[PDB]
Amino acid sequence: VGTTAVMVAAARAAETDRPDALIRDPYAKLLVTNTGAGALWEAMDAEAAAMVEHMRSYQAVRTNFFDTYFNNAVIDGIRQFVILASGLDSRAYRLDWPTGTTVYEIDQPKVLAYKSTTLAEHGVTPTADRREVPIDLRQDWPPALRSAGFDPSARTAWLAEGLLMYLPATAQDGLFTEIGGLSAVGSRIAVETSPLHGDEWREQMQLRFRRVSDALIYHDENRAVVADWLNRHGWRATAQSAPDEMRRVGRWGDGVPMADDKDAFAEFVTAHRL
Template identity: 45%
Template sequence: MTSTRQDGDSWDLASSVGTTATGAAAARAVATRQDRSLFADPFAAPLVRAVGIEALTRLATGEVAPDGVIDQAWIDIAKIRGKFYDDFFLDATGAGITQAVILASGLDSRAYRLPWPTGTVVYELDQPQVIAFKTRALADLGAEPTADRRVAGVDLRDDWPAALRTAGFDPARPTAWSAEGLLGYLPPEAQDRLLDTITELSAPGSRVATESKPNPRPGDEDRTKERLNRISESWRAQGFDADMARVRYYGERNEAAPYLTDLGWVLDATSIRDLLAAHGLSSLGDDDMRMGDVLYVSGDLPMRSRA
């Protein structure tokens, strides 16, 4: 059973918030199987199988069709989200940035599948057991990194900059940072600290990519919880004891896009709704969770915003 989030909690890829990383990888696996022209992650399905959640494995490997298990809109969001972050890193390294940091890397396989320029160092940060599991699972698959991959097993609520520096990170060099699917799983104050710290560790010319969700309107969070509870019930019918409403933090918080802008970042933003339409993918229907209003944002830091 998934427990309610609390300060100091931990997880692996088959428990608590860790199952969201495994579920995201399952969605990437289905997205890859449907159409490799937009986005492809060949490691998603075998990594989900290695985690061992049977219902997600059946979905990821194609043993069951996604119909009736997961809405097509979620698969389509996995396609545009995967492409957005792939393009972000390829554009950044193509422009000469040689240092990338993937925060809360989960089952992200970009260090193994993207064509990184020679000399690129990719840092992955996540819970120690998550990092250890993925490293071992990909080694068992015979996969080799396509960049200089370095890992830091650390909780992002702890002193992760120290762990990052220990792994070799150089704050004097421009960095490409991703915080993909992360911010809603941090308390509001921890989100602010994370974005502050990214900025403090970023040399001029660094880039960042993340999502910026609008603050809830009256009734939004109740509708979100109801929707997540319905999704969880569907998964339980498949034998997966999910409780998706309980792994998020709720309440108002600083929206990421204006917060980063105030820190000195110059950002571009595109909504999920617009990205789906641009690629001819499914609409979000009534969108009771306001997913279409979520912005994918990316940009650079042209100068230090603080003394």
């Protein structure tokens, strides 16, 4: 399991531990105890303190947003779900799924094997029909999803959280093209975008975090804007900036360095298949 998957799960666990938790992920602590990279994250000036609080609050707010997305898709009748680069995401276990729901998780084999074995050791199994699809998303992944039982003629709700900024710009286009190819009318997708001007934030966040601890290689100016791309390849797409969403729920901390550039932060794009 990669460092990023652990860090975001540790953030979810930290949120879950608070009385005022925005989201509750009963499985995040379990998943970050059993790697060892989360002991440091478990442990973690004004700007330095604000960055740690931002890490937790950003992850809480992003988690709440994508939870709401899936929950609204269930309400709307959708019964086929796909979590792309699912990492340590426990939504297949912790959200309420109606009978007849299928939830596909796509990630590399070892990531999926870690989550399943780790959960099993704690007596945790899903009640929903959860289906693993072990494959690299830069490779020919549609046949793998299809052989796992996926029905392209059924409405699908797709999720791509914490993924795009870790894929080259050319790979993003290919991913979305394949997704459109597998999506029935009325399908939806929610996506966390790669920040418009945003590899500098990771540096200043690493710097503030390195001081707290001691105490995007694919950034591309040519990357397609996600809402714009979806809106000309068969979707109706809208964007909510992460800062706007954080402010919406009273979780934005303006003490964070780069607070005034909206381009240092992701957007949350939701789209409907035409």
